[PDB]
Amino acid sequence: QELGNANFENFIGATEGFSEIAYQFTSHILTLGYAVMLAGLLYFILTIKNVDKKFQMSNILSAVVMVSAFLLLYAQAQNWTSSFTFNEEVGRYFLDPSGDLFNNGYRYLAWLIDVPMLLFQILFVVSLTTSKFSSVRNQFWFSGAMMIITGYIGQFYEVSNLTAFLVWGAISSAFFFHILWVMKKVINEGKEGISPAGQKILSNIWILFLISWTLYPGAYLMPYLTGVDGFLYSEDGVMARQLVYTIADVSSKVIYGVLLGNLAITLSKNKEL
Amino acid sequence: QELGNANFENFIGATEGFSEIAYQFTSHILTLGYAVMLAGLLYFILTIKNVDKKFQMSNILSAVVMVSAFLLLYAQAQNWTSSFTFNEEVGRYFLDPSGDLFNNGYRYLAWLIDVPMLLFQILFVVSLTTSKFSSVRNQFWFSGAMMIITGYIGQFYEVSNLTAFLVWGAISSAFFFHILWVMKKVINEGKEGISPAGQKILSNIWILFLISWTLYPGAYLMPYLTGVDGFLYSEDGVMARQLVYTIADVSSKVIYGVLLGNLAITLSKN
Amino acid sequence: QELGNANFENFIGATEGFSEIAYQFTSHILTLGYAVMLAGLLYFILTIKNVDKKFQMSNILSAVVMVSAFLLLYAQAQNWTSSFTFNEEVGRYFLDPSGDLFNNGYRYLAWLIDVPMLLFQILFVVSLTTSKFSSVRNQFWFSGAMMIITGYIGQFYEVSNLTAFLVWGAISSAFFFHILWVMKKVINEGKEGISPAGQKILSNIWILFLISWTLYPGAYLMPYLTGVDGFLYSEDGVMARQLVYTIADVSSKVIYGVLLGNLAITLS
Amino acid sequence: QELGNANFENFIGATEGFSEIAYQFTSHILTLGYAVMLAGLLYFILTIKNVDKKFQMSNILSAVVMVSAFLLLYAQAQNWTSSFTFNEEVGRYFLDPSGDLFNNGYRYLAWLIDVPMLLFQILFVVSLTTSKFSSVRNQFWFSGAMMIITGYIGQFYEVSNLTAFLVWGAISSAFFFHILWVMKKVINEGKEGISPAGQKILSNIWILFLISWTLYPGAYLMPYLTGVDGFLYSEDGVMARQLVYTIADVSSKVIYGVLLGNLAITLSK
Amino acid sequence: QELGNANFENFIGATEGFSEIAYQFTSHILTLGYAVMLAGLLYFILTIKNVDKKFQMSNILSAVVMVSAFLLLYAQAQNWTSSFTFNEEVGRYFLDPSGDLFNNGYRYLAWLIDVPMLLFQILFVVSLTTSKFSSVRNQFWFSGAMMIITGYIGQFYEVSNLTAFLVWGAISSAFFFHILWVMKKVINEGKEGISPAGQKILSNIWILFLISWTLYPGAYLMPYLTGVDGFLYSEDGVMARQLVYTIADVSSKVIYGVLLGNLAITLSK
């Protein structure tokens, strides 16, 4: 069947189809996804006044990211259940083109909000030393945009053109490495002149940032992580991808925002929690 | 009909179908479910300033749980009405696979939010004595996660593989017993150094916690609580399961959060 | 055809069908219903700080009831338009079982929130004298639950089994009479030791409570209030039922909550 | 094609059908409608503390009206797109009875909230002189209810029974004239004892009130304003009706509420 | 197939259809659109108290615009996915008339809120010198309305009548030039009496305003920017149009509102 430049979920759904567990779990994990984000939105708004005025922009930017993540994860949850329909004869869920093909591209364009804001918000909690605020922000935003746009293009070809998929993925990775480099500097400078408690939290933020952000390229490659005709090029890979995205999203956005909020509390003159 | 690793609601819906009462009630009880949660969300936000600053995180976490519960119970209410469609000839609601099979798994993964937050929030009202905050939190979260994940896997097999269903259910129960054990300690230490009024509320919280949380494994086993081909392996069992879930949800989340709020008030200097 | 234990709306919709006016009005009155509740929600939140801290719980509980009523009335509005579809040949709206049968049961289980909270909230404005707070609350909640659950069961049989319908309805009425009795006591004790202004408002609250709450059993019996094959056992009865529910809901929840808020202001 | 006691939009949609422009515009104007109301809701909440406590009830009642108007205009926007479906052969949108017949009745019952609250809220900004607060409120509410209910009944017959349509419309107009009379008194008394700036705003409120409220009976009669088989008894009349409703709604609710808010500011210490 | 006075997206969708990338991207960019607006709504509400009371109306008006933009961009995102359906045989998305024809007109009527409020809100941050507040406001609102209404009419003819399309577009452009002229005056007077930092921000606001607002007529002409049977009269042009709209919307509404907020902060004591 002719699917063109479509995500591998559609090829699995169109040929093998999805078992009850594969279809239900993907739906459940996406639902948890958007549930977490709307819960996070409420948390970040309600905890604004727990930190000094100077730090509250970080809470606001966390909230901004929650709204974006919620809307996108909600939309993507609906796209999943629309794109795959139960076949009574074989008892599996197959591609339902009437619901449109499933595409992860929704997530990517959403990142155009998330990435810039997540990178930006830490600069409202930590004080830079040697690096200039405007410089770090511009590097984050430029490399953030380029990372997303190049990855966005690549993922359309994840089945139709493995070469384009890997080249665009490679280019995207370059910009990612640059972001990791800059965020490392920001963490280091942020540690300078603050309590050991605040330094400990920034150490945790860096580990969280490194793992959670690396999961995204992992999700990108998921179908081919077990090579050609591998275990992962299947419904199991489809489940894995959306699980990894959901773990990444919760970690990179919510847990990240909570740690920043806790850092803001330690750096606050009035608050001591 | 080939349903695979599907919940028993789908087997009842596909064979016997659901009477008007069975279908309507299940829909009504799920609707009440999400209505209560969105009402609770408003209550917990509006009562934040009724307790001292240090206790307000408990109100916030209650609110967080309400958002999760509302979204999931709302989604599950829609999944119910999508999965079962009226047949004019026989006058019963039968499985409509076009709406997807009904699965309780939505609820389970939601618990990944609810359980950790419900267990966590009490540690913002009560003061521990001998137990370390970080230690209790880690035990709650680990055993909470494992309880849910193992139960989640099990419930897929509640018809297709009774053995897998019971083994995973058993493993889940172990983690549940651990949570009960730790929450007992937390309640006891919480009682130390507070007024009799506060101690009374914690006693109520423990009874509420014990009964409400035990209902979940009850809902898990519901179809087989009257044995093979029993009274409960029917639309009556389907009704019972969603009723028990709804009672459990209201009790474990809303009533729990209200009692914690009342405890916070007694512990408040204002 | 076989409808089983279904509400009479489905039998009218399946046999005679609904005229444009009957179908449209039922949809309009249900829409007004949920519109009023979401408007009320905003009113009750925005007026919280108009009364002393001790009374603000009443505003909060009003808000809680608005969220419940909005969600349920909204759902019920959608259920109405899903359950009845236009037939081009005859130009009437007939039962569309693909949308599910219409059931008022949604409203009933919602009352499990509304009734307990509406009864509870007055105990945050008025001071009891002889009656114990906990005692009144428990009586309200128990009799409230039993009234709803018994009525809920009964309304499933409003066509399929007139006997079960009337028996369950009768049992429900008993619990209702108990609630009326207890609320009367609460009003009387509430009047003791407060300004004439506060006493006037409580007098109004009692009249409102009595009429608005009595409309619900009226809506219950609506199809048979004109007896067998009566004027009301028709689309006109379907319209009447949802109108009475909507009047009752607005009165019992919104107007009630406003009067309590006004009482709270005089006592502040 | 038996439509019975249905609005004229359904007869146009069932016979001639709607051009792309007619169908799209009606959808766009209704969408703008509910967009304005939800935007207004946010405005009225966010500006509550811009006036003295005594005037803030007017902001709250504005908000209440916004919630009502938003919900109704949103529902009516969906009803429009559900009731008329594109026919590929002729390239026009025809009545799709599966979506239900289109009815303006949704709006009318909504007015049971809007009218009483809009009339009520001015009594929280202006001070009466001769007239008693309770008396004016009761007159507004009674005549408001009767105006809406009689008009609601009438509009069902706007095609099926022109006589019933005009009689009920006439009775409704009587109650409307009473409301205009009372609101005039309220404006006059409101002007007494306030700054010239406040008097100017009330003069604007009266002009706004008079024009915006008169548009509703205009929308009522729209199909027949060019007589039997006139230019307006067509998709152009359908467009006109919903445009007039939307202008009226924005004017009577949002602009009205803004002017009252501005009056409240001038009267604030 | 008879489409009449329909947008070119429908002609591309009805003839060649849309590739996976073209259909998915258009859907993604519209989704990003409304996501940004709802995120912006939260930002503008939460940052109200970051500026002095006198400037807070600008935050409120930013919020008002976010509500409008969110609702419309959300509706337009749904209209896109409703109007084009996958064909299994050829593996492309074709016009699905059952979902209604796609029309950008939704956006235009929304601008009736956005344009007046965006132009208005700057007058709550900057101080005019020689120009009268009321005069600037009236010029903005009149020319704003006329620009939108004339463009709205024109875009219905973008395929059916190229002449009407260009004439209405031309008339619209005249009103646009007037708005640019007035906003220039406002920027100049705004710079007078404020710190160099505030002047720098206003300079950026003017550049942002000029580029972002010019994108709209660009989106209008998009299908014909490569001439008849050009590269852009295709799915690539459809993608381009919605991309440009989304860049314009984010720039003209959100970034604009942020810069105004930053200006308000520098002007705050």
Ligand SMILES: *C/C=C(C)/C=C/C=C(C)/C=C/C1=C(C)CCCC1(C)C
């Ligand atoms: C909440 C959203 C976040 C944190 C998004 C992060 C996105 C990435 C780190 C993406 C990285 C990618 C690569 C390094 C290669 C393949 C393409 C991407 C965009 C998935």
Ligand SMILES: *C/C=C(C)/C=C/C=C(C)/C=C/C1=C(C)CCCC1(C)C
């Ligand atoms: C509001 C959500 C709550 C309190 C969830 C609680 C969940 C449980 C106590 C689950 C227990 C289970 C077992 C002990 C065995 C079977 C599987 C479970 C997960 C249902």
Ligand SMILES: *C/C=C(C)/C=C/C=C(C)/C=C/C1=C(C)CCCC1(C)C
């Ligand atoms: C806003 C919800 C309210 C006030 C609900 C009130 C419900 C009743 C008073 C119900 C009464 C009934 C009977 C007395 C007999 C028939 C069954 C009932 C439940 C409708």
Ligand SMILES: *C/C=C(C)/C=C/C=C(C)/C=C/C1=C(C)CCCC1(C)C
């Ligand atoms: C925002 C809602 C408002 C201001 C509603 C106003 C409604 C009217 C002024 C209605 C008047 C009518 C007549 C005078 C005759 C025909 C029937 C009516 C109800 C449309």
Ligand SMILES: *C/C=C(C)/C=C/C=C(C)/C=C/C1=C(C)CCCC1(C)C
């Ligand atoms: C957020 C909404 C904004 C800023 C809207 C701006 C709209 C324009 C600048 C429109 C301009 C047009 C022309 C100059 C000619 C063609 C028609 C228009 C309306 C697109």
Ligand SMILES: CCCCCCCC/C=C\CCCCCCCC(=O)O
């Ligand atoms: C599976 C992940 C579930 C997480 C739920 C997300 C919604 C709520 C988010 C965070 C709540 C955690 C509260 C942390 C409190 C930190 C201590 C402090 O503030 O002093």
Ligand SMILES: CCCCCCCC/C=C\CCCCCCCC(=O)O
């Ligand atoms: C069969 C299932 C296998 C995978 C299950 C593993 C899930 C583990 C989940 C949660 C671990 C959380 C416990 C420790 C968290 C403490 C973090 C902190 O200190 O803030």
Ligand SMILES: CCCCCCCCCCCCCCCCCCCC
């Ligand atoms: C401080 C100035 C006081 C003015 C208050 C007037 C309220 C304005 C309402 C919103 C904007 C109205 C005009 C919008 C632009 C024109 C759109 C109409 C097209 C027919």
Ligand SMILES: CCCCCCCCO[C@@H]1O[C@H](CO)[C@@H](O)[C@H](O)[C@H]1O
């Ligand atoms: C860094 C990760 C790159 C690994 C390269 C994986 C090569 C995958 O190879 C592809 O696998 C598909 C399904 O498995 C097959 O259908 C394709 O024919 C095949 O080209």
Ligand SMILES: CCCCCCCCO[C@@H]1O[C@H](CO)[C@@H](O)[C@H](O)[C@H]1O
């Ligand atoms: C308390 C937990 C243990 C209960 C185990 C009950 C065993 C049920 O046994 C099962 O019952 C099904 C429905 O009746 C049948 O269809 C299955 O064939 C049968 O294996």
Ligand SMILES: CCCCCCCCO[C@@H]1O[C@H](CO)[C@@H](O)[C@H](O)[C@H]1O
């Ligand atoms: C209010 C309590 C009195 C109820 C007694 C009314 C008896 C109605 O009787 C019923 O009327 C239905 C409607 O016409 C018929 O369809 C049934 O056949 C008939 O049993």
Ligand SMILES: CCCCCCCCO[C@@H]1O[C@H](CO)[C@@H](O)[C@H](O)[C@H]1O
């Ligand atoms: C302002 C008061 C309006 C006067 C009544 C107008 C009389 C219209 O009369 C009606 O016009 C319809 C329009 O086509 C025709 O279809 C009807 O047959 C005709 O009765």
Ligand SMILES: CCCCCCCCO[C@@H]1O[C@H](CO)[C@@H](O)[C@H](O)[C@H]1O
């Ligand atoms: C000033 C902006 C440039 C306007 C150039 C108008 C020329 C477009 O010309 C048009 O191109 C369409 C696309 O193929 C064709 O379908 C039409 O037949 C053709 O008239």
Ligand code: NA
């Ligand atoms: Na599906």
Ligand code: NA
């Ligand atoms: Na159903």
Ligand code: NA
């Ligand atoms: Na219908």
